[PDB]
Short mmCIF file of C-alpha atoms and ligand atoms in Angstrom, two decimals:
data_model
loop_
_atom_site.label_atom_id
_atom_site.label_comp_id
_atom_site.label_asym_id
_atom_site.label_seq_id
_atom_site.Cartn_x
_atom_site.Cartn_y
_atom_site.Cartn_z
CA UNK A 105 18.29 8.93 3.26
CA UNK A 106 16.93 8.90 -0.25
CA UNK A 107 18.47 10.31 -2.98
CA UNK A 108 15.41 12.02 -3.00
CA UNK A 109 16.11 13.79 0.24
CA UNK A 110 19.43 14.24 0.35
CA UNK A 111 19.33 15.94 -3.47
CA UNK A 112 17.04 19.17 -1.94
CA UNK A 113 19.01 19.48 0.71
CA UNK A 114 21.84 20.13 -0.94
CA UNK A 115 20.56 21.63 -3.88
CA UNK A 116 18.85 24.14 -1.26
CA UNK A 117 22.35 24.34 0.91
CA UNK A 118 24.19 25.69 -1.74
CA UNK A 119 22.01 28.33 -2.60
CA UNK A 120 21.66 28.70 1.36
CA UNK A 121 22.80 32.45 0.96
CA UNK A 122 21.32 33.67 -2.48
CA UNK A 123 19.75 36.76 -2.15
CA UNK A 124 15.92 36.79 -4.08
CA UNK A 125 12.96 38.57 -3.91
CA UNK A 126 9.76 37.34 -1.82
CA UNK A 127 6.22 38.39 -3.68
CA UNK A 128 2.60 37.14 -3.17
CA UNK A 129 0.15 36.34 -5.49
CA UNK A 130 -3.41 36.46 -3.61
CA UNK A 131 -7.01 37.60 -4.49
CA UNK A 132 -9.60 39.08 -2.63
CA UNK A 133 -13.92 38.61 -2.50
CA UNK A 134 -15.35 40.93 -5.02
CA UNK A 135 -18.92 41.58 -5.71
CA UNK A 136 -19.99 43.50 -9.26
CA UNK A 137 -23.12 44.52 -10.24
CA UNK A 138 -24.51 41.57 -7.53
CA UNK A 139 -22.30 39.43 -8.56
CA UNK A 140 -20.00 37.30 -6.66
CA UNK A 141 -16.24 36.21 -7.40
CA UNK A 142 -14.86 34.32 -4.63
CA UNK A 143 -11.43 33.15 -4.41
CA UNK A 144 -11.91 29.95 -6.30
CA UNK A 145 -14.19 31.91 -9.61
CA UNK A 146 -10.82 31.47 -12.23
CA UNK A 147 -11.52 28.30 -13.32
CA UNK A 148 -11.18 28.21 -16.93
CA UNK A 149 -8.98 26.18 -18.10
CA UNK A 150 -7.20 28.12 -20.66
CA UNK A 151 -6.27 26.11 -23.96
CA UNK A 152 -2.97 28.31 -24.23
CA UNK A 153 -0.05 25.36 -25.19
CA UNK A 154 2.55 26.58 -22.09
CA UNK A 155 -0.34 27.01 -19.58
CA UNK A 156 -1.88 23.53 -20.19
CA UNK A 157 1.61 21.89 -19.47
CA UNK A 158 2.03 24.15 -16.58
CA UNK A 159 -0.98 23.04 -15.20
CA UNK A 160 -0.38 19.10 -16.00
CA UNK A 161 2.95 19.47 -14.09
CA UNK A 162 1.06 20.42 -11.33
CA UNK A 163 -1.65 18.26 -11.08
CA UNK A 164 1.66 15.23 -11.05
CA UNK A 165 3.41 17.55 -8.35
CA UNK A 166 0.15 16.94 -6.48
CA UNK A 167 -0.05 13.19 -6.96
CA UNK A 168 3.71 12.25 -6.50
CA UNK A 169 3.99 14.65 -3.18
CA UNK A 170 0.54 13.09 -2.11
CA UNK A 171 0.78 10.82 1.15
CA UNK A 172 -1.67 7.59 1.17
CA UNK A 173 -1.12 5.96 4.16
CA UNK A 174 -3.54 9.24 5.02
CA UNK A 175 -6.28 9.73 3.13
CA UNK A 176 -6.87 12.78 1.63
CA UNK A 177 -9.85 14.75 1.66
CA UNK A 178 -9.38 18.59 -0.19
CA UNK A 179 -12.27 19.52 -2.30
CA UNK A 180 -11.75 18.45 -6.13
CA UNK A 181 -13.10 21.85 -6.51
CA UNK A 182 -9.92 23.35 -4.26
CA UNK A 183 -7.28 20.67 -5.84
CA UNK A 184 -8.80 22.07 -9.36
CA UNK A 185 -8.23 26.02 -8.73
CA UNK A 186 -4.89 25.76 -7.20
CA UNK A 187 -3.23 23.57 -9.92
CA UNK A 188 -4.56 26.48 -12.15
CA UNK A 189 -3.04 29.31 -10.08
CA UNK A 190 0.26 27.56 -10.22
CA UNK A 191 0.31 27.60 -13.78
CA UNK A 192 -1.20 30.94 -13.75
CA UNK A 193 1.45 31.85 -11.20
CA UNK A 194 4.52 30.68 -13.36
CA UNK A 195 2.25 32.61 -16.82
CA UNK A 196 3.58 35.54 -15.24
CA UNK A 197 6.62 34.72 -13.66
CA UNK A 198 7.81 33.47 -17.37
CA UNK A 199 6.13 36.35 -18.84
CA UNK A 200 8.35 38.94 -17.19
CA UNK A 201 11.76 36.83 -17.70
CA UNK A 202 10.72 37.07 -21.49
CA UNK A 203 10.80 40.70 -20.63
CA UNK A 204 14.09 41.14 -19.05
CA UNK A 205 15.55 38.37 -21.71
CA UNK A 206 16.51 36.07 -19.03
CA UNK A 207 17.62 32.85 -19.26
CA UNK A 208 15.39 30.68 -17.38
CA UNK A 209 17.83 28.29 -16.55
CA UNK A 210 19.70 31.58 -14.34
CA UNK A 211 17.12 31.55 -12.41
CA UNK A 212 16.62 30.44 -9.04
CA UNK A 213 12.91 30.01 -8.20
CA UNK A 214 10.40 28.70 -5.50
CA UNK A 215 6.84 28.42 -5.41
CA UNK A 216 4.50 27.77 -2.97
CA UNK A 217 1.04 27.69 -2.25
CA UNK A 218 -0.85 28.15 1.18
CA UNK A 219 -4.11 28.61 3.40
CA UNK A 220 -3.93 31.70 5.54
CA UNK A 221 -5.93 31.93 8.51
CA UNK A 222 -7.92 35.43 7.59
CA UNK A 223 -7.01 35.87 3.83
CA UNK A 224 -6.80 32.11 2.74
CA UNK A 225 -5.06 30.56 -0.75
CA UNK A 226 -2.33 32.61 -1.71
CA UNK A 227 0.76 32.01 -3.27
CA UNK A 228 4.45 32.79 -2.49
CA UNK A 229 7.13 33.13 -4.71
CA UNK A 230 10.75 33.42 -3.98
CA UNK A 231 13.01 34.61 -7.23
CA UNK A 232 16.74 35.63 -8.24
CA UNK A 233 19.61 35.25 -9.79
CA UNK A 234 22.43 37.14 -11.35
CA UNK A 235 20.41 38.72 -13.18
CA UNK A 236 18.48 40.88 -10.55
CA UNK A 237 19.03 43.42 -8.47
CA UNK A 238 17.55 45.16 -5.34
CA UNK A 239 16.69 48.29 -6.82
CA UNK A 240 14.57 46.53 -9.50
CA UNK A 241 11.94 44.79 -7.28
CA UNK A 242 9.30 47.65 -6.98
CA UNK A 243 9.24 47.17 -10.85
CA UNK A 244 8.99 43.33 -10.81
CA UNK A 245 6.05 43.43 -8.64
CA UNK A 246 4.44 45.94 -10.93
CA UNK A 247 4.81 44.13 -13.72
CA UNK A 248 4.09 40.77 -12.21
CA UNK A 249 0.62 42.61 -11.32
CA UNK A 250 0.15 43.46 -14.48
CA UNK A 251 0.47 40.15 -15.69
CA UNK A 252 -1.70 38.74 -13.03
CA UNK A 253 -4.33 40.89 -13.28
CA UNK A 254 -4.71 40.35 -16.96
CA UNK A 255 -4.38 36.44 -16.54
CA UNK A 256 -6.86 36.10 -13.73
CA UNK A 257 -9.85 38.29 -15.94
CA UNK A 258 -8.92 35.95 -18.84
CA UNK A 259 -9.30 32.56 -16.15
CA UNK A 260 -12.56 34.14 -14.20
CA UNK A 261 -15.54 31.38 -14.93
CA UNK A 262 -18.09 34.64 -14.06
CA UNK A 263 -20.08 35.77 -16.35
CA UNK A 264 -19.21 39.26 -17.07
CA UNK A 265 -19.64 42.57 -19.09
CA UNK A 266 -16.85 43.94 -20.59
CA UNK A 267 -17.41 46.65 -18.12
CA UNK A 268 -17.36 44.35 -15.18
CA UNK A 269 -13.87 42.87 -16.88
CA UNK A 270 -12.61 46.26 -16.91
CA UNK A 271 -13.08 46.93 -12.65
CA UNK A 272 -12.16 43.38 -12.13
CA UNK A 273 -8.85 44.15 -13.73
CA UNK A 274 -8.25 47.33 -12.05
CA UNK A 275 -9.12 46.65 -8.88
CA UNK A 276 -6.55 43.40 -8.84
CA UNK A 277 -4.06 46.27 -9.80
CA UNK A 278 -4.92 48.87 -7.60
CA UNK A 279 -5.37 46.78 -4.89
CA UNK A 280 -2.24 44.84 -5.14
CA UNK A 281 -2.76 41.50 -5.64
CA UNK A 282 0.45 40.84 -6.07
CA UNK A 283 2.99 41.77 -3.06
CA UNK A 284 6.18 42.28 -2.52
CA UNK A 285 8.20 41.77 0.95
CA UNK A 286 9.70 44.94 1.97
CA UNK A 287 11.26 46.55 5.37
CA UNK A 288 8.77 47.53 8.31
CA UNK A 289 8.18 51.75 7.40
CA UNK A 290 5.28 54.06 8.08
CA UNK A 291 2.48 54.68 5.32
CA UNK A 292 4.46 58.45 4.22
CA UNK A 293 8.15 57.09 4.74
CA UNK A 294 9.55 55.11 1.80
CA UNK A 295 9.51 50.98 1.12
CA UNK A 296 12.59 49.64 0.72
CA UNK A 297 12.39 45.68 -1.34
CA UNK A 298 13.74 43.76 1.66
CA UNK A 299 15.54 40.43 -0.14
CA UNK A 300 15.66 37.44 1.61
CA UNK A 301 17.90 34.50 1.55
CA UNK A 302 16.66 31.47 -0.88
CA UNK A 303 17.57 28.19 1.06
CA UNK A 304 17.61 29.69 4.57
CA UNK A 305 14.07 30.62 3.91
CA UNK A 306 12.74 27.50 2.24
CA UNK A 307 14.55 25.23 5.00
CA UNK A 308 14.06 26.89 8.06
CA UNK A 309 10.44 28.06 7.27
CA UNK A 310 8.46 27.29 4.12
CA UNK A 311 9.35 22.99 4.21
CA UNK A 312 8.37 23.78 7.63
CA UNK A 313 4.34 24.24 7.29
CA UNK A 314 1.71 21.32 7.54
CA UNK A 315 0.55 19.55 4.69
CA UNK A 316 -3.75 20.72 3.76
CA UNK A 317 -5.68 16.93 3.59
CA UNK A 318 -9.14 18.29 4.36
CA UNK A 319 -11.43 20.77 3.54
CA UNK A 320 -11.75 23.13 4.57
CA UNK A 321 -8.10 23.56 5.16
CA UNK A 322 -5.85 23.80 8.40
CA UNK A 323 -5.29 27.50 8.85
CA UNK A 324 -1.37 28.04 7.81
CA UNK A 325 -1.11 25.22 5.68
CA UNK A 326 0.37 24.27 2.38
CA UNK A 327 -1.61 22.79 -0.55
CA UNK A 328 1.67 22.45 -3.03
CA UNK A 329 5.58 23.79 -3.68
CA UNK A 330 7.57 23.66 -6.37
CA UNK A 331 11.19 24.97 -7.29
CA UNK A 332 13.24 25.45 -10.34
CA UNK A 333 14.94 22.31 -9.79
CA UNK A 334 12.22 20.16 -9.58
CA UNK A 335 13.97 19.54 -6.23
CA UNK A 336 10.87 19.68 -3.56
CA UNK A 337 8.03 19.49 -5.90
CA UNK A 338 7.60 15.82 -5.05
CA UNK A 339 8.54 15.59 -1.69
CA UNK A 340 6.03 14.39 0.64
CA UNK A 341 5.21 16.39 4.12
CA UNK A 342 7.61 13.75 6.29
CA UNK A 343 10.51 14.10 3.40
CA UNK A 344 10.19 18.04 3.81
CA UNK A 345 10.67 18.05 7.32
CA UNK A 346 13.72 15.68 7.08
CA UNK A 347 15.30 18.50 4.56
CA UNK A 348 15.50 20.48 6.96
CA UNK A 349 16.70 18.44 9.90
CA UNK A 350 19.25 17.47 7.27
CA UNK A 351 19.83 20.92 6.30
CA UNK A 352 21.00 22.54 9.71
MN1 MN B 417 1.77 32.48 3.65
#
């Protein structure tokens, strides 16, 4: 019952029923003119001040949440790429907030990087607040995908011709490398944005995942999480499960 565990539980419980959007930021494998662009082909560390700061935040979140009782054999390249993506995902969120003139302190958000059985790396984002409404979900997805595709093409470490960069940009947008949770439907039928409950989804779902400690990653595991209150960031796996238990 450390203050950190109690503090996270209390913070989430207060936001138990806050409606938020659910996004997934991802990438897919691409081959352009014989050039392979895989999930971890975006390893440029761009020297923009905010991005550098965000990447440092991810590194330190990883460092503080690491359990040293057990050894961790995650590949260095994998960690690097995840830290970079954490900075890029956040940069996208912050750019859209700026477009809407939303004060960052008026926003609740949660970010969690995972490795899926079939898709591999992806990043969940829950985001909402008083300045957000369900009808804005589709606009948010589109804007986030614009910024996400733009930053990915900038961060790509594969030498690309201008035509190739533009093609990659178009692929990331056309194939919706940012997804928005909607109610189940038909291809022809309309899709409705499905808002989720912030604290509940975090405590009863995201905090239940198993920590990735190996390469290749365990199917369905998580790498790293963070939130707008810096509450879950530094928690070890065992502490996260304690939060879920207390939250109930
Ligand atoms: Mn997932």
